[PDB]
Amino acid sequence: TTILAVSYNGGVVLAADSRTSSGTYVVNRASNKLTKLTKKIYCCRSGSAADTQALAERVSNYLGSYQTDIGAGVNVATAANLFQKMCYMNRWNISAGIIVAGYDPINGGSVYSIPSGGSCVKLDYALGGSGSIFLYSFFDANYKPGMSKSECVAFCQRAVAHAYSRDGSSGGLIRTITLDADEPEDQTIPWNRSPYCMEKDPKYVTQATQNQPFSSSAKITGNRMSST
Amino acid sequence: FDKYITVFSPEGSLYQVEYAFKAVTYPGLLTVAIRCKDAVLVVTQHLIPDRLMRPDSVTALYEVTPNIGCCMTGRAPDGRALVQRAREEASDYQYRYGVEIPIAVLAKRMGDKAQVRTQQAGLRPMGVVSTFIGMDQSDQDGSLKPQIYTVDPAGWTGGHIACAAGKKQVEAMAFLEKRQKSTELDALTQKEAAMIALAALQSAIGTAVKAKEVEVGRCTAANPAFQRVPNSEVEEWLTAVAEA
């Protein structure tokens, strides 16, 4: 899993790969890990599909009740707070990295990370999933904040692609959604138009030279490609 | 002895339930609801005699869910409480089944809730008539049909084409029956309907209404969410009534 969210001026992007794996087999290659909580507030789920689907459904339910009751929009902080509560109450029995991100008119776009222990941290961007370990340096090196919506979408797609090109546990599509004052725009990049992969990076086209032919010299030539 | 507790009288009637019906008319407000081909409207009086009261703060219209409105008529705080219960019911239902509660089910469950108060002693029946409106998806085509379900303090639940509750609910009804012999009410337009509703309200309460003395709620096939109709548009219907 690779999930992330990034703020831009006036909203957020969420992004995720689509793969759900039972270890080394892919049970679902088109999962949707961007889960709607309210109209403009989403979570990205990582960890146990079961656990995260159960919490998201629970929180989305509570939040719809709550919106009907106060007769007004919900804040992202409220959604994060609830998520945090539930994640923390059940921290021993669930595996669950969440990101809660969305747009509310009081605070603009926000991002909260709620990692396994049930901390809740408000950030500019957040990463989660097994694939996130690959993006920390990518962000450190290549993410400048203050990006436009469209730049930010493309950057999150790149970021996911980089992650899932190295994490065996992430893969497939890249789903994104933006969340701001306007209508949510979901997007889905199929793998074969991924903005990065190792199988198409020109610096990984030359094969490692492992299968040298038997020679009278130490000079390395190439792999032996043919018997003759 | 039977007048004060939920046991049967010798005639086989439940006094406290009958009296709860009088709680419906006691406030002096009338409500009317009506469905047309692709919408449903509910109109209720919204009387603010106190110049110092804040009109937008008092209402008898309530979102139950985004796709179900209701209008409570009667003892206002009892209505507010039923709304809470409805809301809970609707939300427990969405959690359990993953779908928004159909309005006829919600009505039925609120009728069950009321019925209970008439059979278990020492719970006061809520003195309201609840009127849920909403759209409802059909299993054949998937098209949305508009619905009006009432629930009354006895727990009697019903679907309606048009319905009135509150003071002069009889003279309102009589007017709509009469206008149902002319036209077919489910072939009307949201305008012709609202006109009928507003005209029925006006007939019953014996006065012409202004826009700010009503509050109107609506669901439409196009936009199924339940929405307070803005005053501009109620003014235009009220103009269309005084004329034609």
Side-chain angles (χ1 to χ4, degrees), chain A residues 58 61 65 68-69, chain B residues 63 84 91 94-95:
Chain A
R58 182 77 274 176
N61 192 259
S65 282
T68 285
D69 205 70
Chain B
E63 153 194 323
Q84 273 355 106
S91 67
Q94 148 81 56
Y95 186 69

Side-chain angles (χ1 to χ4, degrees), chain A residues 17-99:
Chain A
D17 74 303
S18 83
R19 158 173 313 190
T20 290
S21 52
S22 236
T24 55
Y25 179 69
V26 178
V27 279
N28 185 359
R29 73 177 173 95
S31 68
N32 199 341
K33 296 167 180 173
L34 304 191
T35 293
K36 163 171 152 139
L37 295 183
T38 77
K39 195 166 189 227
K40 304 292 186 70
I41 302 179
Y42 272 67
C43 61
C44 332
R45 299 181 288 103
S46 55
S48 164
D51 289 314
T52 58
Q53 292 176 17
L55 290 170
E57 272 150 355
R58 182 77 274 176
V59 171
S60 185
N61 192 259
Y62 286 145
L63 283 183
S65 282
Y66 178 69
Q67 177 172 358
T68 285
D69 205 70
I70 77 193
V74 176
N75 294 341
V76 179
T78 300
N81 196 73
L82 262 184
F83 237 124
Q84 157 165 59
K85 208 96 171 308
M86 296 201 75
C87 283
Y88 180 85
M89 279 334 113
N90 312 299
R91 61 191 174 297
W92 294 125
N93 320 301
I94 75 181
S95 127
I98 300 298
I99 291 170

Side-chain angles (χ1 to χ4, degrees), chain A residues 184-202:
Chain A
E185 286 147 43
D186 73 64
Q187 190 179 334
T188 286
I189 305 327
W191 178 82
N192 77 86
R193 291 194 260 114
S194 177
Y196 179 72
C197 61
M198 289 190 322
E199 310 92 302
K200 287 165 189 180
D201 191 345

Side-chain angles (χ1 to χ4, degrees), chain B residues 55-79:
Chain B
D56 75 28
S57 75
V58 66
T59 185
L61 297 193
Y62 297 93
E63 153 194 323
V64 167
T65 73
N67 306 311
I68 299 167
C70 72
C71 186
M72 298 287 154
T73 297
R75 198 196 176 67
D78 288 358

